[PDB]
Design a protein around this ligand. Structure first.
Ligand SMILES: *CC(=O)NCC(=O)N1CN(C(=O)CNC(=O)C*)CN(C(=O)CNC(=O)C*)C1
Ligand SMILES: *CC(=O)NCC(=O)N1CN(C(=O)CNC(=O)C*)CN(C(=O)CNC(=O)C*)C1
Lengths: 272, 271, 276
């Protein structure tokens, strides 16, 4: 399936099953395929599951412009409009946690039932004047330098810290191959611009505007997006939010802790 | 090229050359690209060759619903009508042998000139109460368990028994990379649903409805689709079918025995 | 993005940025992604960059017919008509240097401001009765034989001489993986047909019809398209052409000499006028 964004960008999405809708937002470098196990899980258990490829990623068009959170949220808004979804549970991984939040911030929660933030960059990732505990900006500057040199090798190297393979997590050669294959479909321009986006976007104002049930899951061994200054604070700022911390879990915990995540997601959807 | 199916599914295909049309139906985990050598071979010899990516595979859409042989057959039906084909030679590999057979069963043979079944699941793969010699269903349930955990590694591990690498067949790392690349395009849901499909679907009634010249080819070293209870039986059930057995050949003989298959396909067309 | 060619083939393209248009034509086995770095460099510096997947490659359709330089040229002409481009700088790598050259010969240079030939097959790759210095046709016959047995392995093996890895160039496994992944998207037919095309197509007539400022860049360690009988000769045959030779550079110098190429393209786009 696809739909056309306002600026003319074609976005690829999957729409599986029937019942209450659940809309997934993927992380940096990936596409909708990072959700396949979670989507299959819930759709054969009576839910409708929807995942899209962010502009510049996967099977979607690769525009030069609009590689910003504001546009990402608006893309999501249009997907929901195109499908006429109601009572939507928004699920965001990594940087994809930003755009599900930014959606609610910009469009309200009229159509939203709940929110799930998986190892998300909310509320801030990068360091600010009034947020020194964040990740220094020279880290992300070093990313862009290597991306603009050899992004193929960078993605390949990203696998080890991402999955926590350098810390005794066992991930198959297949998953490593699949991760790199998907990553290479993406736009070099979108890859680099996203760094800027997720590094410097402040979602603290968004945190105040979330007025739906919220589940925050984060690994305490996450080497990419540090729990202490992201997930932990997100659960504090969002009213009535629940937190679950997976012990020793890495960034890419949708792979390593797949069964745990599937059950937590289902439990959340069945609340009260 | 693509067409839009009844339910709205977009299906990618290739239409090469001109002449007598030959329509290819690919196996599990693969796509239209597995046919590339056969297609170039025949089309550069004055045939028209057509191959589609099955729903949920390759460059086609990935619908939740319709992952069954009845729908698979209707998809072929729609392709044929889209291209206004007549005197088609249906060629099917593995589970792809199912939907070509079901097509003939559902729509009749008016547009069909011939049928070729390559290491095909027909007439019946999995075990039934009235088919005890079939493959026990738990074998396929074990496939589902692994696929629902890590399909990426499953595909990767599948290369060895598929190609007969574990029996001293020679396949490059190139082919192995391409097989995994093509496989990873596929829908998880479609991959799983297909096991149910090829495991439990009965094509015995379909065998009676095949009224066209048929060539059955199967390798006797096949570690995936057992020759003894499929291909051997298919040739017996289809009226006037011809059987060729490739000695010690694996399931993926389209690769290992490519030249022989190319020659046998040409020979059939010139019957 | 895509457009529909005359025969109904759909061709994928990228159209990035604003400014004077730069139109990239990729080489054998590849697609528009080989240009990502050049495209990002130029588009962040005031230029509009456009790159298509040749028919039978990348994300484009894979037709049986029309895998020849005439159609290739017409495909470029239809893209230019579709976006209504003017003052285009045509940039072609390897076999893609042939299709930009043929475009100019067929359609003229009304909409063309300049031409850049990178490791191009121009003016002639394969041997001829009146061009014995070309690569003997037996070599290309051998290519097809192998491609028609196992193209997947051929591409994988091709990485070494393509990037000059066998001569101590440093190329990451990532790049090697990317090159093989992209190449596998392509049609078997297009792959083989292109060999016939680049082996036998004579662009010598075309050279005489190129009336625009031209930059020829080639590496003098090129193992695929030999400098001495291609780039070196193109620089003589096209009137007013500028030549730049990258020392010990391989065929795939857009990877190994990325930064050098980027600055060379920008310099060329920013050139001044001459008096004639
Ligand atoms: C399989 C098929 O019918 N293909 C043609 C087709 O689907 N369309 C409809 N289009 C789209 O769906 C565009 N994308 C979205 O709406 C997300 C528009 N079509 C084309 O773009 C045709 N031209 C090219 O593909 C270059 C036709
Ligand atoms: C630069 C280089 O040597 N590249 C080869 C390469 O990276 N691959 C990709 N593969 C893997 O990474 C294997 N998996 C793991 O290491 C977890 C697959 N490759 C091979 O296995 C090479 N040989 C064969 O496939 C026969 C190639």
């Amino acid at each position: 399936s696809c739909f056309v964004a306002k600026d003319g960008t074609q976005i690829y999405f999957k729409d599986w099953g029937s019942g209450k809708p659940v809309l997934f937002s993927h992380g940096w470098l990936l596409d909708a395929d990072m959700w396949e196990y979670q989507m299959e899980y819930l759709s054969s258990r009576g839910y409708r599951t929807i995942a899209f490829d962010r502009r510049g990623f996967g099977r979607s068009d690769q525009p030069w412009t609009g590689n910003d959170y504001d546009t990402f949220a608006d893309d999501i808004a249009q997907l929901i409009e195109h499908l006429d979804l109601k009572e939507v549970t928004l699920v965001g991984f990594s940087m994809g946690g930003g755009d599900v939040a930014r959606y609610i911030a910009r469009h309200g929660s009229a159509r939203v039932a709940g929110l799930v933030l998986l190892g998300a960059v909310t509320p801030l990732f990068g360091q600010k004047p009034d947020y020194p505990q964040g990740v220094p900006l020279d880290v992300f500057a070093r990313f862009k330098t290597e991306l603009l040199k050899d992004r193929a090798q960078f993605i390949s190297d990203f696998n080890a810290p991402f999955y926590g393979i350098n810390k005794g997590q066992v991930v198959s050669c297949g998953v490593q191959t699949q991760t790199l294959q998907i990553a290479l479909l993406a736009s070099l321009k979108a890859t680099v611009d996203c760094v800027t986006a997720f590094a410097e976007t402040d979602f603290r104002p968004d945190m105040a505007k979330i007025d739906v049930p919220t589940l925050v899951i984060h690994g305490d061994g996450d080497q990419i997006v540090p729990f202490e200054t992201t997930g932990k604070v997100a659960a504090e700022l969002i009213k009535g939010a629940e937190l679950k911390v997976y012990k020793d879990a890495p960034h890419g915990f949708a792979v390593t802790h797949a069964q745990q995540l599937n059950e937590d997601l289902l439990a959340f959807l069945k609340r009260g």
